[PDB]
Design a protein around this ligand. Structure first.
Ligand code: NI
Lengths: 256, 250, 253
């Protein structure tokens, strides 16, 4: 019924899960993610038909992304890994209602959701290259189903932020609205969907999930990528990137 | 050479298949689809280079859709349209609904009137759409967009359809026919064999999302659960009974 | 380093590879491609972090594309697209002028595409009756949707830089006067990021992008069709018409 790190409300058949982790700017800490997951789980009932994920009204930062301090950081059972999986497999639609700036891991988190509705002032950025992190295959895969290849590559390689208007243009966002209408706009849609056949929505969603994951390869290729990842994890650049982050200074990458 | 449900006209290398089932709003009935398929088949000749599918001029409704086994009409037509060695352009005028949307999605190009509208509606009736069918709807617009389309069953405008990648071109209704024909004639000057093989290569790549038998069987199990649900009955009912369904999750 | 068909200049951590074959409109000749590949290869050093591919300033034609199974594993275009894709540094295609045929696939295979508001693009295999290969076709499907791709290929009609942007092919469109500066700045910016991270992600993206698999029978079946095209009358006609600079007359056989 209650959680330390999220606040939940139910409005008819729609449930809203609001973050309650502001000190860390909603960074994806284990305790935080665990509460989000418990909440979702608790909401997996016939009477609940649609979920909305959001940061508190007026938030400057929607989510800072991975919790560096807490630091292979992207292993199967890591929080971010677990949540994306859960969200994707959840039999009810999940809408990310965005207010504030979205960063790295949080960006992957919202991409994994079903729909994204955002304020005209929100911003988006994918940042593993800033810290020198060798992002995982599944993680990367999750960022390629909406905008095209070139676009995705620009986001990742530059780690530069994009406006909500651009995010809408490239296919990332569903709708962009004025912050004052965000909540209202999102709820209307949620209630609308909640009037539809839940069982059909569930199956279609899973069909989409399964098709979306269907980029297959042989074990040698996976092991080869994994070897590359290890090499990155073992590099100087990797240490340099984390420190600089922790040290709140510009990193000096050298290619080894 | 002649059909009950469709009218065909050939202009040099271009063939126009026009629906003739307005009384039923061009619903995807077996009879209708059977004629569509026959007409396509009859047009599979070296001298025909490009096909155009359309509803009669001035139509308010392009197709109402349904009236999902491997051999059901809709499944049959999408496969056929996809394997057809000639390009097939859907020239849309009017509102597009359900099965009809998948049908045009399965085609090579879609050119529509500035006033046309589109909706996928399986969630309105509680239908557990099939994997192949859903797959057919994921090659043009992004995942988040498709999910919105499908989950809301809300109509979108021709302008949004264009913006998200579903449509090739949107034009004033008065110019629709000519714009389409000109593009068709132009394609007809190109190498047909090359077009054919490239279309097929695209088709094969497009289907190349593979999975194991267990996954397939698992989805099949889920689908069956849907067809066996109360909600499913309620959905068919309400449609018939022309009333809003009351879904409950069982 | 030096090459006959391309020029190279390094600016800090960025390297610019410029085509030097205007006499032939930068057609994708073997000797041209070989040079490009060597230049990339020579640039595969820790101090180089980003690459820019471009045609000379002012070019009216970025690349005419193909020069007279020509699409075999070891053909130049086949080799260069693989190279570009496997290159552990980002490769940005900076476009000024018109882009044609193979050159279009070439830029598509790169990481980002930034172009002049006046540039244009056309996929032309259907003009000549060429049975494009699977890998080649695949390379053209990761940016714009299916319907759009099919229109480009089926019509072989050129599209504007504005439309290329709108359908997802291009990253940015800029006024020629600002093309260079805009491109360089981004490249410099990329150069400040973690190279190793970039390389692994790029390779992950490549592997995922190729991951549309099929059985041997399907592939052989495609090959058989391709071969039938190559053996057709229309194939001869397309090549001849092109040489004789006259409109081809295709018949379906
Ligand atoms: Ni795919």
């Amino acid at each position: 019924m209650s959680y330390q790190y999220v606040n939940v409300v139910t409005i008819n058949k729609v449930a809203v899960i609001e973050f309650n982790y502001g000190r860390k700017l909603n960074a994806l800490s284990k305790v935080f993610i665990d509460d989000l997951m418990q909440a979702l789980s608790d909401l997996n009932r016939p009477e609940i038909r649609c979920i909305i994920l959001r940061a508190p009204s007026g938030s400057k930062v929607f989510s800072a992304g991975h919790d560096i301090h807490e630091l292979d950081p992207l292993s199967y059972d890591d929080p971010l890994r677990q949540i994306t999986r859960m969200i994707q497999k959840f039999p009810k639609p999940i809408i990310s209602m965005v207010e504030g700036s979205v960063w790295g891991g949080a960006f992957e988190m919202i991409m994994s959701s079903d729909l994204i509705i955002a304020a005209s002032t929100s911003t988006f950025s994918m940042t593993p290259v800033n810290l020198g992190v060798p992002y995982n295959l599944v993680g990367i895969h999750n960022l390629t189903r909406d905008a095209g290849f070139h676009i995705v590559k620009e986001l990742i390689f530059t780690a530069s932020p994009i406006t909500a208007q651009r995010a809408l243009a490239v296919g990332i966002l569903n709708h962009v609205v004025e912050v004052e209408e965000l909540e209202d706009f999102t709820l209307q849609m949620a209630h609308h969907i909640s009037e539809k056949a839940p069982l059909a929505i569930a199956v279609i969603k899973e069909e989409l999930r399964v098709l979306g994951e269907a980029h297959t390869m042989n074990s040698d290729e996976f092991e080869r990528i994994q070897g590359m990842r290890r090499a990155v994890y073992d590099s100087e650049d990797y240490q340099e990137g984390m420190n600089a982050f922790l040290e709140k200074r510009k990193p000096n990458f050298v290619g080894h």
